């Protein structure tokens, strides 16, 4: 009777049929694999909206400790969850040829290696009964062990500016959350795939909502357009300074100088910097002049980079806790653990301790 997804054959149409049937009451879906059966209570994520170039994208949550979640666009679907400590993504595109493109893309780093356990890290999933690829499974923890690439990091990934003077606006919980747009611009000459950008956006918004019950204060609305801007060199600081300047000469962006902006690319910057941000540059009461802007990679192997940079924009410092999203080297963790950072972030979104969690 209960709906299920067979991970040995999961396709775009499987994911779309199951997730489109999720009502406001939620729905139990069993994830099945060889000797694996996880019952997941799936709900629509109504906190976040996403428009990419070509599609509206909807998000879905489980309520489990292994944070099962889904992404559903018109063109693609993602299932992500943790299993035995490691994050696993199932990525399924609707058009067979773009699925073929995506599979080739993700298979390419493993071409050199002939690892005996390759399928643990990367596997093409074939249509149920030459078969076609209908999804790919990626375990980035096992992939990192196999590929053994040099680590990218965040050292010196922000620009700090003289601290704002204090100037009595604080209020209780608003009757509705404030809508904050996160306007993402695909860097000129960059190829971004929708599963990769959407995952970063989901992780970014969710890193904020997990703090001080902030969905009462903010609902993020992501929008992705193309920009003619590209960073003039590999310098990240220079790149951001030029990006912020490019927002001021975009006649389309007039009227939205009080929103949050990211320049996104697939790759990284010089010294293997993953992103860049203006530090403590967004406050709900004062946001202006495109100051809440930053840059972020979108590659699947670096989850949470845009969350990390959004943390900086909202005032979060690096921490010494290697389990924190805000650690200065890349950890793959996705949650704020610093109480000081949590208080700073929430205060910039209008929360005060009197309001509770």
């Amino acid at each position, epitope marked *: 009777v209960t709906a299920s997804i067979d991970l040995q054959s999961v396709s775009y149409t499987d994911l779309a049929t199951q997730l489109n049937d999720v009502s406001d009451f939620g729905k139990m879906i069993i994830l099945k694999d060889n000797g694996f059966n996880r019952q997941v209570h799936v709900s629509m994520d109504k906190r976040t909206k996403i428009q990419l170039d070509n599609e509206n994208v909807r998000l879905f949550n489980g309520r489990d400790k292994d944070s099962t979640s889904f992404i559903l666009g018109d063109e693609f679907a993602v299932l992500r969850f943790y299993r035995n400590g490691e994050s696993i993504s199932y990525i399924a595109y*609707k*058009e067979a*040829q*773009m699925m073929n493109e995506i599979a080739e893309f993700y298979a390419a780093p493993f071409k050199k290696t002939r690892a005996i356990n390759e399928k643990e890290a990367f596997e093409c999933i074939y249509d149920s009964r030459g078969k*076609d690829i209908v999804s790919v499974k990626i375990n980035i923890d096992k992939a990192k062990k196999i590929l053994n690439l040099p680590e990218c990091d965040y050292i010196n990934d922000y620009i700090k500016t003289p601290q704002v003077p204090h100037g009595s606006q604080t209020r209780a919980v608003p009757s509705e959350p404030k809508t904050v747009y996160v306007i993402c611009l695909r860097e000129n000459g960059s190829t971004i795939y929708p599963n990769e950008v959407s995952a970063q956006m989901q992780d970014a918004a969710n890193s904020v909502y997990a703090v001080h019950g902030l969905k009462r204060y903010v609902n993020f609305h992501f929008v992705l357009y193309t920009t003619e801007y590209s960073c003039p060199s590999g310098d990240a600081k220079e790149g951001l300074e030029g990006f912020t300047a490019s927002l001021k000469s975009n006649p389309k962006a007039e009227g939205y100088d009080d929103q949050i902006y990211f320049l996104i690319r697939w790759g990284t910057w010089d010294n293997k910097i993953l992103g860049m941000s203006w530090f403590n540059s967004y406050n709900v009461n004062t946001a202006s002049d495109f100051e809440a802007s930053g840059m972020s990679t979108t590659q699947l192997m670096y989850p949470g980079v845009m969350a990390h940079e959004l943390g900086h924009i909202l005032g979060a410092e690096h921490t010494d806790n290697s389990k924190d999203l805000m650690y200065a080297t890349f950890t793959g963790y996705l949650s704020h653990l610093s109480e000081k950072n949590m208080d700073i972030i929430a205060k910039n979104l209008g929360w005060e301790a009197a309001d509770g969690d």
Partner: nanobody, 122 residues
Framework: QVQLQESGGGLVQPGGSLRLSCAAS????????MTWVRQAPGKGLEWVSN????????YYADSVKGRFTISRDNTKNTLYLQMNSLKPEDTAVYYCAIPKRTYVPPSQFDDRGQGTQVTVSS
């Protein structure tokens, strides 16, 4: 193997209409972006139109926009090209094809049908 077979070609006078059909088998048609291309004698292969898996998105060469309509029936595994307001420069062999990628205009294809002849006299 992939099999594609075009039909519906013929000779018309300028201003005429034709409807091309392409019967597909050997692959899961309903999952694939599909393409019409045409080739005039001694000329390069010219992209005509794309349609995505479910028919919700269509794309056209500038020279045929407003005159040609691509469509598909995923239950009958058939691709269509409705050709109105035909002109002499539409004369060519027309092929339905699986493009290697979804980007437009495609120039690289995985398989093609054997073609159907369209002639518009002048």
């Amino acid at each position: 193997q992939v099999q594609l077979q075009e039909s519906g070609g013929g000779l018309v006078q300028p201003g005429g209409s034709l409807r091309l059909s392409c019967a597909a088998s050997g692959f899961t048609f309903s999952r694939y972006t599909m393409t019409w291309v045409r080739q005039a004698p001694g000329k390069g292969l010219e992209w005509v139109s794309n349609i995505n898996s479910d028919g919700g998105r269509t794309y056209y060469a500038d020279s045929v926009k407003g005159r040609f309509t691509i469509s598909r029936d995923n239950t009958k595994n058939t691709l269509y090209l409705q050709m109105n307001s035909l002109k002499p420069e539409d004369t060519a062999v027309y092929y339905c094809a699986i493009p290697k990628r979804t980007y437009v205009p495609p120039s690289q294809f995985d398989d093609r049908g054997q073609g159907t002849q369209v002639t518009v006299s002048s």
